[PDB]
Amino acid sequence: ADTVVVNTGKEYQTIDGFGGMNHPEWMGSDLTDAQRQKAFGNGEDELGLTILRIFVNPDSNQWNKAVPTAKFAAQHGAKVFASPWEPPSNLAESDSNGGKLHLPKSNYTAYAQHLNNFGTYMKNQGVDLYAISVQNEPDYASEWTRWSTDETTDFLANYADKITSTRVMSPESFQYAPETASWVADGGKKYYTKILNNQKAFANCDLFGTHFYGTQRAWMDFPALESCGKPIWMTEVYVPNSSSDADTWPEALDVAENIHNGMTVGNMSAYVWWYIRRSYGPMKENGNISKRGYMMAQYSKFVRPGDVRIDATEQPTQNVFVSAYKNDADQVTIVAVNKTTSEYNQSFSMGSGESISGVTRYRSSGSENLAKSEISFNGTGFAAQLPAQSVSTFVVDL
Ligand SMILES: [F-]
Ligand SMILES: [F-]
Ligand code: NA
Ligand code: NA
Ligand code: NA
Ligand code: NA
Ligand code: NA
Ligand code: NA
Ligand code: NA
Ligand code: NA
């Protein structure tokens, strides 16, 4: 294997965090106090999530259902953002072009007020809502609200400046599909390019969100969006499916590969799962962390808001995926996903020249969950075994 060369002087995106969705209406119950602590604490056997996504109910008389878990997350320092699936029923019309609903242009001002008022309500409930998005999956909307890519751009350019209670997030595409994709009539990356290309829409859009359903690694690179000066969040996914129990192994390792790809190929600042607590989620219905959740935790517990992704040899051997981050205490955190069936010894080196003063490893695999050990080092480098089908997070003191 190539030595993994890490360079603290070459910086990419700032990390906003890692999280999941809470949706009492659709999940059937809210998180309990124990589950809230399990998700948003960063102590022993806690997921260390730092972002919570919440639901914008079309009926404002139901907004209160989102509040208790948002307040808990906010008290533990998490960013809280919200997504709408449908306008208030009085603003929505049946769609005859593939969606269930459509928002008529004549109702855009009222819809922006609906989103603004949700932000104000959250603030009055003690939650400074980080952002609200224009629409969940406007390009996969057979059961909610379809928007064309022109429509979301018009909304952002000409109406979203009146959302002042919170930041404005882009519409959230289903899968970040290539613009010329034959299977998507009007969606995917087109939602984003049209914002970048319209001065008013870009000025009124504070950050971007996309989902990752079926998103290939080869679709994650988006040069114009990655250089525009505003964060891109991956705001919803489950991988590789919802049909398997989240302890299924080695299937769960796909979660770590997907996070790695979003971080290093997509320059994503955030990675947000769907329901936190679910049979296929990071927390099981019995409240314990699943294998998929330990895959998330290898990132979320150690790559914290405000950390900066830095250069590190990304694929030193095929299907061994490496990313690295620095924090404001000058620690470097390296996450190595060995997705192969072979164990080998991997060397690491600080190309930026810093001497190492300590290395601690946390590792998850078929038989380990966040297993902790001390790693020897010498000068500017260290080496470690990477077992087959494992995720190793190295915390490096310089
Ligand atoms: F704005
Ligand atoms: F990229
Ligand atoms: Na940065
Ligand atoms: Na709501
Ligand atoms: Na907060
Ligand atoms: Na909704
Ligand atoms: Na209508
Ligand atoms: Na209106
Ligand atoms: Na989500
Ligand atoms: Na499996």
Residue 339, SS3 per DSSP: coil
Instruction: Rounding to the nearest 10 degrees, give the CA dihedral for residues 309, 312, 315, 319.
Output: -50
CA–chain centroid gap for 64, Å, is: 25
CA 348 to CA 359: how far, in whole Å? 11
CA 133 to CA 191: how far, in whole Å? 13
Beta strands 270-275 and 232-236, pairing class: parallel
Q: Which ligand is nearest to the CA of 13?
A: 3
**Phi, then psi, of 192 in degrees rounded to 5:** -90, -45
To the query of whether residue 314 is one of the catalytic residues in this protein, the response is: no
- The residue type of 208 is F
For 4-9+310-397, CATH gives 2.60.40.1180
Q: For the beta carbon of residue 212, count every other beta carbon within 10 angstroms.
A: 26
309 beta partners: 325
Ligand 2 center from residue 309 Cα (angstroms): 12
CA 164 to CA 36: how far, in whole Å? 29
DSSP state of 197: T
CA 120 to CA 118: how far, in whole Å? 5
- Among residues 86, 151, 172, 236, the one annotated as catalytic is 236
- Among residues 86, 137, 172, 257, the one annotated as catalytic is 137
Q: What is the resolution of this structure in A?
A: 1.4
Q: Which ligand is nearest to the CA of 252?
A: 10
Ligand 5 center from residue 397 Cα (angstroms): 29
Ligand 2 center from residue 366 Cα (angstroms): 30
Ligand 4 center from residue 24 Cα (angstroms): 9
**Phi, then psi, of 285 in degrees rounded to 5:** -60, -25
Asked if residue 110 lies in contact with residue 58, where contact means CB atoms within 8 angstroms, the answer is no
Q: How far is CA 141 from CA 144, 160, 170, 239, 345, in A?
A: 5, 21, 16, 20, 47
Ligand 2 center from residue 262 Cα (angstroms): 9
**Experimental determination approach used:** X-ray
**Strands of the chain, DSSP E:** 4-14, 17-21, 51-56, 79-84, 93-94, 101-102, 131-133, 167-169, 208-211, 232-236, 270-275, 308-312, 320-326, 332-338, 344-350, 358-364, 371-375, 381-386, 390-397
Ligand 1 center from residue 168 Cα (angstroms): 7
Q: How many CA atoms lie within 13 A of 191 on its CB side?
A: 34
Buried b (16+ CB within 10 A) or exposed e, 86-110: bbeeebbeebeeebebbbeeebbee
Q: How many CA atoms lie within 13 A of 274 on its CB side?
A: 19
- The residue type of 363 is R
Q: For the beta carbon of residue 197, count every other beta carbon within 10 angstroms.
A: 11
Asked if residue 267 lies in contact with residue 14, where contact means CB atoms within 8 angstroms, the answer is no
Ligand 2 center from residue 221 Cα (angstroms): 4
Sequence spans of domains, the chain? 4-9+310-397, 17-305
DSSP string, 25-90: HHHSSPPPHHHHHHHH--STT-----EEEEEE-SSGGGGGGGHHHHHHHHHTT-EEEEEESS--TT
CA–chain centroid gap for 304, Å, is: 13
Is 17-305 in the same CATH topology as 4-9+310-397?
no
End-to-end Cα distance, the chain:
24
The pocket of ion ligand 4, defined by CB under 5 A, consists of 55, 57, 63, 66
Q: Which ligand is nearest to the CA of 116?
A: 1
Residue 173, SS3 per DSSP: strand
User: Taking phi first (over 0 means left), then psi (-120 to 50 degrees means alpha), and beta for anything else, what does residue 361 get?
Assistant: beta
Enter the tokens of residue 147. Answer: 């928007």
Q: How many CA atoms lie within 13 A of 275 on its CB side?
A: 20
- The residue type of 27 is M
Q: For the beta carbon of residue 36, count every other beta carbon within 10 angstroms.
A: 22
CATH topology of domain 17-305: TIM Barrel (3.20.20)
375 beta partners: 359
Asked if residue 133 lies in contact with residue 172, where contact means CB atoms within 8 angstroms, the answer is yes
Enter the tokens of residue 111. Answer: 């819809």
CA 188 to CA 28: how far, in whole Å? 30
To the query of whether residue 143 is one of the catalytic residues in this protein, the response is: no
Residue pointed to by tokens 């991988």 = 239
